[PDB]
Amino acid sequence: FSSKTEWRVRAISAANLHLRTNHIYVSSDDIKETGYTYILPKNVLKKFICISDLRAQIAGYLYGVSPPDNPQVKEIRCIVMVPQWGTHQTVHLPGQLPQHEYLKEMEPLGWIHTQPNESPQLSPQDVTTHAKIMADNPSWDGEKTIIITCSFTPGSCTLTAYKLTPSGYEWGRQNTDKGNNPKGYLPSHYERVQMLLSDRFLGFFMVPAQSSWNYNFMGVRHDPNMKYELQLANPKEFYHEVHRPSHFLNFALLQEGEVYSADREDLYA
């Protein structure tokens, strides 16, 4: 980013993200039928789209349970936002997975992220990210956890859901190179999975304890090994004042400017 002009164009843009919110598409494609099927409550989806930005990827972590007596469907009941920052093609979020009390009741279902340009494939950066989570986390089950990619289409939003195949998981555990075309990448690595939106139940948010989630505007304050706690509260928007301290901390001024126009007229209170 240009860090001056580049900030503002996208900033007055993102104030319209809520317009997208009511036009969304969902990939319908061939159902494995032996697979799990994930239901995403619409409210969290709306809010998640609304906090995002149209260039930097933001990501969120999925937490849910399967409804009683129906083990093959996973309701996503919660999204957790952790300290993070994006690129246009990927997202850097820390090594620690969410730990918190409200979360103990549910299982992790993977993660969801915004995708500035729509691609009909799981980006190598993603399969690599996911495998590398999975390597370090037994908590995440290969077969149960997914990557939901939410892409910004014109005036719209459109989303797909992927699972790593074991081929993919091994490649990704192995993979170093984060470029858009790493060696040995294959369409054999991922698999699409069945997902539905729902108005039947409401999902909720988990959000960083002492800060907010969006570190894009401080990259030096973000570290892979950084630790965080959580709370029950909603995410602030991308360009929200808090995510942007450096800019509100731009004041170089001498007080005596106030000497000029010392006619104080007030008369009201």
């Binding site: 009941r77 301290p245 509100f248 901390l249 004041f251 007030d266 009201y268 209170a269």
Partner: protein, 1525 residues
């Protein structure tokens, strides 16, 4: 006749206060016109003082009354005019008007008018006791207000009376200015503050208002003064309580018109003095310039300045008023460089080289301003901008005459007072950002600055020189000699004025509107000069009173307000209705075009980017435009702003936006035009942004109310949030702040660090302590929440706010304001919000707020409870409330349908003797009764009947009683009600119903065990309250009279829900246990209001579902119309006061001719509200409308009265009922009401239960009440409210019954939900538990832990626990869940009971009562009480100790604390035999100690606390005996 719409545009006066209504002017005597090239110059000489009249002398400060003389020190004699009117000043309440020239010293006249009132309240042994009166001084200018409070303070300080400026934001300083008298303010301030109601707590304590410089009537600001005074007068006509009004004006014609306006009797009240009375005679010079081209003009005026100034260059003094900031010093240095260009001519401003102190001007050398250049020479400059102290240092220099040339601004004339030998006004034109252009300065500005001409002391006569444009030259003559009419600009503002009056409720309809306008200055002007105001004389003759013009006028205002949605007013009725938009508009003094712009523009989804634009579109800014020259700088500013404007290009929107940002971002601007503009924008911005916040918050749209309150704060504080909060403490160094901003270390992480750890971050350790202070000065709340589900739809939230910050009144001041708002799952919708205000006293005291919130069908992961300071920026705390574990209650089955039955005649029961006690009362039983009948009467089984209060369940009980009557001669029946009042109320009926007609003996239980025992068993029907029937019947095993009862009746069982409910629950349960052991069935009949969970109650009390009748509140014999009225004023006094008028209106609307009961929060409030009902009764022009008999008939009743005011209120048909009234007085009032003599009775809330007289309309006023113990208000218990509502029932006659409940904003939704639906009821036994286990263990009903659990299973708690487990903090609905829960329960109850030595627990299994518990159980005393006794009473204790030990008893904490009982009990405690060790006077134990000693000393107290004393004494002996034991 029907009204017609007119155009208010061509009907106003543009360029107001420059108006010049007369087109002809006059010479003075020796005046001449001499025209030069390019400029006409007019000269008038000084006036000739009127020769002293025969035997007319000045008054010294001696010969005027003794008291007032104080504070006049330094002044030996009164001014001629002061001396003229002092008599009427101090000897009459007649209103005043004086017209006297500038310099006559008008203030000291008005001062006397104040010293009279200050004297009206005086005592011998104390002076000027200050809570009787307050005075309001309205002055036109701010500087003038400041300086006036400054000197008034000094002067009046001898009296010790506290006078202050009213700059207060409404809420933080009200309770501050509560203690303030003689408050000074600008008319505007008074108008907003009255529109909000900050005044309505002050008024009626106001006997005097001063209008100073009332000629401001002619200014655009005029309508405000017109609005003030009109309101004051129109109000006095309603209240009949009068006020003095003292007007002060410059000398101008239309004096008699202003007189009419102020209701000044021209005879004794009018005072006029012409321009000859100016203390320093004024020679007037006026030079108008004919030059059209401005380029040549800006030379000509320079040169006129030079010649005029060189004229006085000898021994004399000149003062130049320029209207520019910078040009104060641009005008100087022109004179200087000219004097240098003069070949050193004009110089030597002294008597010599060294003479006249040139070393004075040289030795003062180094100064803050540009003075260093000018000071070595003869002249200098003055203004507010460049310096603070050096202004005072220049004023000192001018007074002592070391500078004979001073160029300055109007704020110098309006500020601290110094004159000049001759003053010169350069140009008269100023820049008006409000008007968007340049315009000639106001009347008061010149009048003030030219009234500075000449000294009172060092001068002979003053001169003044006004350099203006020739075209305005006529105008400025019509002023400074009295030619100018004072006219009203009121028409321009008429739509805005009307709104605010509807908003205050002072105008309901068109008629009240014309009545109001009939009090305006514009009215008398339209009367006496119709020709000017747009009325031809012929149609004036056609309508002499202007009824049809005042009807046409205001009709257009009504239409404008309707079209912008400020008011809903239909032409047919002529009535107005206020909308919240209207209120917001009035409260912020924002125009009605701006507000509709906001209505259409504002949507939930608005970004900051857009919020600013909407702000920029405010109609208040309509004339602001963007100039070519400044579009160069605006672009730079546009790229240096944080919030993108880029939606807009260069147009007014952009200019205003970038300006607001510039101000917040704190940016200095090169152009002067832009500076003034920016100032305008930002000053109006506070009110504007705030009205936005209020609107958008009332809508409930969370995100935008955040963005808008934050904007408000950013405007107030002049910074963005991205800057360190420490900046709001201005006490802090800038470099330190910038330093902590340098390193990014999130602010809330400063609390973890100590004084040293702080300084280590910025490597400035010397600061380490001071920083720390501020970090802990910054307001911080921590908050906890206790949440329990009520119904599947609603949860209850108890928020506990604990102050985490150190209070300093030099920072936080008297009060700190916080919004608490609970937001939904996405932080999208605001489900609920309250305004919470923590006062000074109560920092560190945790406050408890209780409120309900709804839940919805996709049950969400959590809500959020947000709390944010109003004024404080970056100060917020959020609290996730997680539902992850929430278990919602089982949805409630539909109420049993009301069957359609042939209404049962009394002829049903074949018993004639029974028929007799009904037939002559009502012909038919109601559908409820007739549906219950066969089950309750012809059949023997337990029934439950819920129906909402007013359904007639009492005779449903009487059915069962009659059945038992047939069953056996001696048949025994016990009847229970939770309210003792209700019990006596039942007894009075049933004693005649049964004992009188049916010969069957009827009794009513009492305190004493013995007498009570004897009572039952002689009686067939035993009426009692749960506590009386607990103590007796705990021992039931031994008392055969308990066991042998045939029937058992529980009335109002839903009351289980409330406190003193557990005892009810426990006695019904016990009753069942007895029927278990007695082997005979004991029929139980329970009666409740509509109950959602009635099933549980029935299952508990053993009713088959077939005999269970639970009815919906919509089933009532007489239908009810319920209305709820929300009031947004949180401060309870103001709220309670502002619902006064609505009460009257609620009567006139809902029940004009029918009986009306009004319930009130306070014992005393009943009087006051009866009064107010009568005083606003006069308003209607309708007097004594509520009295239905002649005064001759009421005399026999009034002979029995003590209370004198009650006589009055009764005389007009009202009357009241409360604690203090003698039972005869009460009986009388009740009689008068029911008989139909008086149509309205105001009653204390306490009397809702025990009142035997019903009504048609019931109005509940303000559902909160005051509790001294936590020092806060607390809501009416819901069942109470339902009872008050049920008090509107009149089945005999009315086809309907009506209720209006006026309550706070917060409490609105709660009533909307729970008054209509059937009610849920939960058990409280889990909390109040020990006492009963103890007592029961004593009877050996619980022999061991097992028996304890078993006992638990007989309760209603047992029933409910699995129904709504989250309420009882039971975490699962399972079997072992409930089992483990009850287990843990008896476990800890028995443990706590064993710790207290009331029982002994053997083997861990068995239990036995011990000494303590035995005592407790015997005397029916709380167990903690006698434990306290156990650790308190020692070997050496005596009556001194026994008093306090017996006082701390638990049964004495039921004793409450009333409004300001902290001083009362202190005054009593002073004079009692035994003093106390640092007693807190809000504590009921202390109060009972003091009341007890008072009783021992036979001191007669007020009946208020005497009642209390009696109640203490009632239960005293038992406690005493327990101590003996």
């Amino acid at each position: 006749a029907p009204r017609q719409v007119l155009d208010l545009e061509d009907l106003v006066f543009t360029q107001g206060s420059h108006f010049m209504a007369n087109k002809r002017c006059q010479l003075p005597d020796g005046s001449f016109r001499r025209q030069r090239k390019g400029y006409e110059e007019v000269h008038v000489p000084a006036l000739k003082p009127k020769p002293f009249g025969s035997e007319e002398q000045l008054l010294p400060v001696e010969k005027l009354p003794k008291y007032a003389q104080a504070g006049f020190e330094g002044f030996k004699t009164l001014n001629r005019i002061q001396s003229k009117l002092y008599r009427a000043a101090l000897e009459t309440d007649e209103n005043l008007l004086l017209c006297a020239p500038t310099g006559a010293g008008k203030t000291n006249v008005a001062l006397m008018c104040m010293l009279r009132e200050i004297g009206k309240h005086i005592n011998m042994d104390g002076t000027i006791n200050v809570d009787d009166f307050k005075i309001i001084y309205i002055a036109p200018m701010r500087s003038l207000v400041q300086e006036m409070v400054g000197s008034f303070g000094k002067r009046l300080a001898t009296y010790g009376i506290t006078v202050a400026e009213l700059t207060g934001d409404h809420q933080l300083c009200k309770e501050e200015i509560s203690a303030t008298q003689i408050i000074v303010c600008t008319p505007e301030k008074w108008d907003i503050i009255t529109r909000k109601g900050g005044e309505r707590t002050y008024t009626q304590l106001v006997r005097l208002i001063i209008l100073d410089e009332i000629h401001l009537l002619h200014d655009d600001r005029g309508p405000v003064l017109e609005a003030l005074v009109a309101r004051a007068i129109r109000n006095i006509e309603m209240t009949q309580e009068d006020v003095r009004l003292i007007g002060l004006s410059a000398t101008l014609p239309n004096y008699e018109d202003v007189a009419t306006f102020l209701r000044v009797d021209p005879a004794k009240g009018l005072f006029y003095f012409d321009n000859s009375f100016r203390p320093v005679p004024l020679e007037q010079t006026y030079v108008g310039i004919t030059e059209k081209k401005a380029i040549k003009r800006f030379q000509i005026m320079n040169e006129i300045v030079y010649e005029k100034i060189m004229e006085h260059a000898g021994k004399n003094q000149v003062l130049v008023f320029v209207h520019s900031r910078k040009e104060t010093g641009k005008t100087a240095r022109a004179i200087r460089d000219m004097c240098l260009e003069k070949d050193t001519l004009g110089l030597f401003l002294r008597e010599g080289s060294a003479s006249t102190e040139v070393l004075r001007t040289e030795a003062e050398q180094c100064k803050n301003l540009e003075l260093k250049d000018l000071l070595p020479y003869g002249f200098a400059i003055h203004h507010a901008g460049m310096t603070r102290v050096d202004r005072t240092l220049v004023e000192d220099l001018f007074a002592d005459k070391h500078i004979q040339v001073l160029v300055s601004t109007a704020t110098l004339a309006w500020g601290v007072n110094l004159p000049a030998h001759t003053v010169i006004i350069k140009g008269t034109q100023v820049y008006s950002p409000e008007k968007g252009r340049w315009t000639e300065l106001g009347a008061l500005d010149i009048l003030q600055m030219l009234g500075r001409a000449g000294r009172p002391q060092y001068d002979t006569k003053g001169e003044g020189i006004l350099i203006t444009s020739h075209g305005e030259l006529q105008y400025y003559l019509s002023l400074l000699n009295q030619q100018l009419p004072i006219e009203s600009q009121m028409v321009s503002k008429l739509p805005d004025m009307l709104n605010a009056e509807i908003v205050l409720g002072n105008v309901q309809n068109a008629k009240d509107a014309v009545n109001w306008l009939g009090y305006a200055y514009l009215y008398i002007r339209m009367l006496r000069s119709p020709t000017l105001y747009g009325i031809s004389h012929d149609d004036l003759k056609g309508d002499p009173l202007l009824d049809q013009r005042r009807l046409d006028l205001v009709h257009t205002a009504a239409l404008m307000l309707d079209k912008n949605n400020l008011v809903k007013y239909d032409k047919k009725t002529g009535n107005f209705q206020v909308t919240e938009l209207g209120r917001i508009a009035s409260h912020y003094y924002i125009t009605n075009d701006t507000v509709q712009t906001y209505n259409q523009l504002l949507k939930p989804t608005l970004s900051e980017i857009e919020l600013f634009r909407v702000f920029s579109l405010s109609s208040e800014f309509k004339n602001i435009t963007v100039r070519e020259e400044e579009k160069l700088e605006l672009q730079k500013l546009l790229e240096r702003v944080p919030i993108p404007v880029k939606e807009s290009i260069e147009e007014p929107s952009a200019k205003i936006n970038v300006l607001l940002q510039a101000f917040i971002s704190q940016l200095k601007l090169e152009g002067f035009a832009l500076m003034a503009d920016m100032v305008y924008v930002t000053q109006s911005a506070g009110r504007l942004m705030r009205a936005i916040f209020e609107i958008v918050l009332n809508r409930g749209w969370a995100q935008l109310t955040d963005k808008t309150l934050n904007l408000c704060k950013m405007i107030d504080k002049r910074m963005w949030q991205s800057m360190c909060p420490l900046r709001q403490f201005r006490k802090l160094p800038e470099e330190v702040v910038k330093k902590i901003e340098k390193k990014n270390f999130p602010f809330e992480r400063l609390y973890d660090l100590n004084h040293n750890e702080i300084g280590e971050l910025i490597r400035m350790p010397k600061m380490g302590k001071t920083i720390h202070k501020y970090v802990h000065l910054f307001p911080k709340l921590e908050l906890s929440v206790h949440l329990q589900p009520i119904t599947r739809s609603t949860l209850k939230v108890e928020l506990t706010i604990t102050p985490d910050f150190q209070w300093d009144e030099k920072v936080h001041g008297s009060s700190e304001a916080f919004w608490i708002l609970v937001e939904d799952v996405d932080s999208e919708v605001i489900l609920h919000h309250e305004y919470f205000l923590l006062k000074a006293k109560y920092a560190q005291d945790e406050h408890l707020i209780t409120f309900f919130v709804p839940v919805f069908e996709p049950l969400p992961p959590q809500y959020f409870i947000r709390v944010v300071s109003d004024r404080w920026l970056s100060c917020e705390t959020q609290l996730p409330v997680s539902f992850r574990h929430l278990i919602l209650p089982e949805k409630y089955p539909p109420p049993t349908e009301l069957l359609d039955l042939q209404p049962l005649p009394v002829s049903a029961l074949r018993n004639s003797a029974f028929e007799s006690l009904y037939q002559d009362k009502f012909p038919f039983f109601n559908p409820i009764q007739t549906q219950v009948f066969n089950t309750v009467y012809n059949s023997d089984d337990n029934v439950f009947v819920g129906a909402p209060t007013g359904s007639g369940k009492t005779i449903c009980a009487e059915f069962a009683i009659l059945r038992m009557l047939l069953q056996s001669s001696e048949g025994r029946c016990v009847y229970i009600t939770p309210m003792e009042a209700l019990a006596e109320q039942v007894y009075m009926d049933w004693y005649e119903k049964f004992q009188d007609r049916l010969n069957k003996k009827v009794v009513l239980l009492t305190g004493e065990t013995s007498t009570d025992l004897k009572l039952l068993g002689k009686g067939n029907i035993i009426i009692s309250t749960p506590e009386k029937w607990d103590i007796l019947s705990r021992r039931w095993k031994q008392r055969k009279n308990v066991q042998n009862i045939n029937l058992f009746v529980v009335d109002e069982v839903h009351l289980i829900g409330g406190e003193n409910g557990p005892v009810l629950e426990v006695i019904c349960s016990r009753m069942r246990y007895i029927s278990s052991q007695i082997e005979r069935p004991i029929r139980i009949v329970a009666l409740s209001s509509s109950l959602s969970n009635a099933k549980d109650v029935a299952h508990w009390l053993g009713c088959s579902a077939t005999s269970t009748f639970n009815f919906h509140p919509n089933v009532r014999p007489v239908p009810l119309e319920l209305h709820i009225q929300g009031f947004n004023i949180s401060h309870t006094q103001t709220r309670l006061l502002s619902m006064a008028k609505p009460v009257y209106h609620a009567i006139t609307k809902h029940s004009p001719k029918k009986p009306v009961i009004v319930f009130v929060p306070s014992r005393k409030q009943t009087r006051l509200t009866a009064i107010d009902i009568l005083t606003t009764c006069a308003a209607d022009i309708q007097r004594q409308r509520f009295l239905h008999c002649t005064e001759k008939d009421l005399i026999p009743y009034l002979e029995k009265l003590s209370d004198s005011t009650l006589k009055e209120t009764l005389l007009n048909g009202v009357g009241y009922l409360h604690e203090g009234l003698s039972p005869m007085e009460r009986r009388l009032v009740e009689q008068l009401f029911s008989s139909g003599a008086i149509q309205v009775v105001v009653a204390s809330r306490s009397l809702c239960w025990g009142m035997n007289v019903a009504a048609h309309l019931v109005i509940i006023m303000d559902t909160q009440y005051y509790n001294g113990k936590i020092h806060a208000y607390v809501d009416y218990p819901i069942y109470d409210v339902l009872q008050m509502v049920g008090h509107a029932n009149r089945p005999l006659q009315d086809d309907e019954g009506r209720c209006v409940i006026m309550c706070q904003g917060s409490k609105k939704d709660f009533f909307k939900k729970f008054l209509y639906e059937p009610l849920p009821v939960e058990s409280h036994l889990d909390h109040c538990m020990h006492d009963h286990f103890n007592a029961e263990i004593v009877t050996k009903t619980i022999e061991n832990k097992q028996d304890a659990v078993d006992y638990l299973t007989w309760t209603f708690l047992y029933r409910r626990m699995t129904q709504n487990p989250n309420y009882y903090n039971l975490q699962g609905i399972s079997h072992r869940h409930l089992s483990d829960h009850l287990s843990e329960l008896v476990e800890q109850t028995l443990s706590d009971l064993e710790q207290s030595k009331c029982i002994s627990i053997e083997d861990e299994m068995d239990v036995a009562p011990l000494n303590l518990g035995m005592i407790a159980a015997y005397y029916y005393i709380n167990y903690t009480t006698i434990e306290l006794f156990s650790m308190s009473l020692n070997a050496k204790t005596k009556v001194r100790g026994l008093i306090e030990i017996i006082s701390n008893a638990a049964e004495y904490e039921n004793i409450p604390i009333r409004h300001h009982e902290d001083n009362l009990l202190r005054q009593l405690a002073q004079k009692v035999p035994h003093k106390l060790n640092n007693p807190k006077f809000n504590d009921p134990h202390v109060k009972t100690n003091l009341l007890l000693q008072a009783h021992l000393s036979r001191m007669q107290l007020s009946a208020e606390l005497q009642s209390d004393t009696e109640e203490i004494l009632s239960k005293a002996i038992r406690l005493i005996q327990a101590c003996v034991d």
